[PDB]
Design a binder for this molecule. Structure first.
Ligand SMILES: CCCN(CCC)S(=O)(=O)c1ccc(C(=O)O)cc1
Lengths: 115, 508
């Protein structure tokens, strides 16, 4: 099958940087659509950023444009996601999919912004 | 002495010779309308999965927790999440089995909105056009042969009635297959009326009016496609617009009941009593009777006897088979590319009405340019030119990203204009190239293969899911090859106009 274990959950004060990565298998990091979505407590799971196949392009969110960075790594078949100047409302449970619509969904990683 | 002599005795410019032709060509406007119609009827508005009704649409997050975005930040076409949030305190994706939600921003309700022809089994939209064009070809064959067996007035009446009823019932069609069969019948009638218009008008007109007939039919075609532009700008609903473009055949049938049958067909049919009656009637309508009084049964009997006195031999002769194959392949490629170009305007960005009217505008200058080049430089070099510019237009439109709009639209406009010019050029060349023995059958074969290409055009365009623009790639690849083959064929700037199969090798 395909595994999508993600790690990087922790509590960091606002303005810090946290690197989040998902351990993928069964496919390359540049052969399929790759996106990471966030689900805040009481909010809806909204798309944040994505990485296409073969580095076709990079997209972000309207509230996240110029706020976070989405990167991939084909060596370990993982995508490293890091953000700078975390907003107080950025605290959410992050997750990763397998495509723009795919049968594989990540387990989920929760991060805390606090103050 | 021939029929042209007695016609010029009657005239050729009189009141009848204008009212009959203009009335008979009047429905060609709506013919062009119906041929293009699927473009304004089968538009696909932006759409997405309908969220399940069990879950709340307000407190649960809104219209974003169920519909993944696309590459451009738009909702997915035919896919949705099973759950809004997938938290542990199975399959996640799911097709829109709870229906789809469209938008009424520009197009209120089209066929794809009425029957949900998206994603899986989305090819039915192109299937409808392909089957309509299959009906066109079947009509142009079988109805043409039936008309040759029986006549022209009655066949025109049947075509009018069939077109009107088929259009109305297709407008009020409950199920998809019913609509497709109604389109089949509509094409069956429409191709027959289209060809029989030209054949009747060329039969009733003198020898020095064929160019007049051609330019008139081209002008009416362009004005009718402009008329569709206007009508689409008027009424957006598909049912109302379908009825608006279907009724004028129904009303025109009433005054169509007063057509005059082809006197030449009657003479070729072997009977001359009704022929003499027809000439007396047209003389009465033309207002002259003293000269037509001398017209007696023996008068035209002594006048029309020289002319009175198929495919197997077409394919048997090697040179004739070769040039027929080249000509028919040219017809196929030209018609196929033209309808592939004109049937698609979704990825043009601009409004449908504006692109349609500019398409209407470009045709007349293209006709002028083609006439000038054929009367000054020649017909063949203009032919391969027009195909080269059309092909390059199509490929560069395909490769250029969708973001560019003005350049894409102008380039498609130029491609369509030069393709219509190539259409006039190929018709003229085929008419002036074939020997007189098989000239009519050669025109028929060219038309049939052009209809075959037009038939396969929607089939090719259906494969847009494999790659978003490779239908455009094929549309632009076909007539480059067509120009390549047309680069080799005998040239007709010596005005030979062959009449016997033995003459073609003499010229070349
Ligand atoms: C130069 C006149 C050529 N004509 C043919 C007369 C029968 S036409 O009237 O312009 C015409 C009709 C129908 C179609 C089509 O359905 O593809 C295309 C062209």
């Amino acid at each position: 099958q395909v595994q999508l274990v993600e790690s990087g959950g922790g509590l960091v004060q606002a303005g810090g940087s946290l690197r989040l990565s998902c351990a993928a298998s069964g496919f390359p990091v540049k052969t399929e659509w790759m996106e990471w979505y966030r689900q805040a407590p009481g909010k809806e799971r909204e798309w944040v950023a994505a990485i296409w196949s073969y580095g076709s392009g990079t997209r972000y969110a309207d509230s996240v444009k110029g706020r976070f960075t989405i990167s991939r790594d084909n060596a370990k078949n993982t995508v490293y996601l890091q953000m700078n100047s975390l907003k107080p409302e950025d605290t959410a449970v992050y997750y990763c999919l397998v495509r723009v619509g795919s049968w594989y969904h990540g387990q989920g990683t929760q991060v805390t912004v606090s103050a | 002495m021939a029929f042209n002599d007695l016609l010029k005795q009657v005239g050729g410019v009189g009141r009848f010779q204008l009212i009959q032709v203009t009335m008979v060509v009047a429905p060609l406007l709506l013919m062009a309308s119906h041929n293009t119609l699927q473009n304004f009827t089968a538009a696909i508005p932006p759409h997405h999965c309908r969220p399940p009704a069990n879950a709340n649409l307000s407190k649960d997050g809104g219209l974003e927790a169920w519909l993944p975005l696309d590459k451009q930040g738009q909702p997915e076409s035919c896919l949705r999440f099973t759950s809004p949030q997938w938290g542990p305190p199975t399959r996640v994706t799911e097709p829109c089995i709870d229906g789809w939600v469209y938008d009424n921003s520009t197009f209120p309700s089209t066929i794809v909105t009425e029957w949900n022809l998206v994603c899986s089994h989305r090819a039915f939209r192109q299937l409808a056009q392909s089957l309509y064009m299959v009906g066109v070809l079947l009509g142009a064959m079988v109805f043409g042969y039936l008309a040759d067996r029986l006549g022209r007035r009655k066949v025109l009446i049947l075509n009018y009635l069939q077109t009107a009823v088929s259009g109305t019932c297709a407008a009020y069609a409950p199920n998809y297959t019913v609509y497709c069969v109604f389109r089949l019948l509509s094409g069956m009638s429409l191709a027959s009326i289209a060809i029989n218009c030209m054949t009747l008008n060329v039969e009733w007109m003198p020898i020095h009016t064929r160019a007049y007939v051609g330019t008139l039919i081209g002008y009416v075609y362009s004005l009718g496609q402009f008329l569709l532009a206007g009508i689409a700008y008027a009424v957006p609903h598909w049912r109302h617009l379908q009825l608006v473009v279907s009724v004028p055949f129904f009303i025109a049938f009433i005054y169509s009941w007063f057509f005059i049958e082809s006197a030449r067909w009657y003479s070729s049919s072997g009977r001359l009593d009704l022929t003499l009656r027809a000439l007396q009637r047209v003389a009465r309508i033309n207002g002259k009777q003293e000269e037509g009084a001398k017209l007696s049964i023996e008068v035209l009997r002594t006048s029309l006897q020289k002319e009175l006195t198929s495919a197997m031999e077409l394919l048997r002769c090697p040179t004739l088979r070769h040039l027929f194959l080249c000509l028919s392949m040219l017809w196929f490629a030209t018609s196929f590319a033209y309808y592939g170009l004109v049937m698609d305007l979704q990825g043009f960005g601009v409004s449908m009405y504006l692109i349609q009217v500019i398409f209407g505008a470009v045709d007349l200058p293209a006709k002028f340019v083609c006439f000038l080049v054929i009367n000054s430089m020649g017909r063949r070099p203009a032919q391969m030119a027009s195909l080269l510019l059309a092909g390059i237009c199509i490929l560069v439109n395909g490769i250029i990203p969708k973001s560019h709009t003005i350049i894409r639209t102008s380039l498609a406009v130029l491609g369509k204009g030069c393709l219509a010019s190539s259409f006039n050029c190929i018709f003229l060349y085929t008419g002036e190239l074939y020997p007189t023995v098989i000239r009519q059958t050669g025109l028929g074969m060219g038309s049939t293969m052009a209809r075959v290409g037009s038939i396969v055009s929607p089939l090719v365009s259906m494969t847009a899911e494999f790659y978003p623009s490779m239908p455009l790639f094929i549309f632009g690849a076909v007539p480059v090859v067509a120009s390549a083959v047309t680069a080799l064929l005998p040239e007709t700037l010596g005005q030979p106009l062959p009449d016997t199969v033995q003459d073609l090798k003499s010229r070349s």
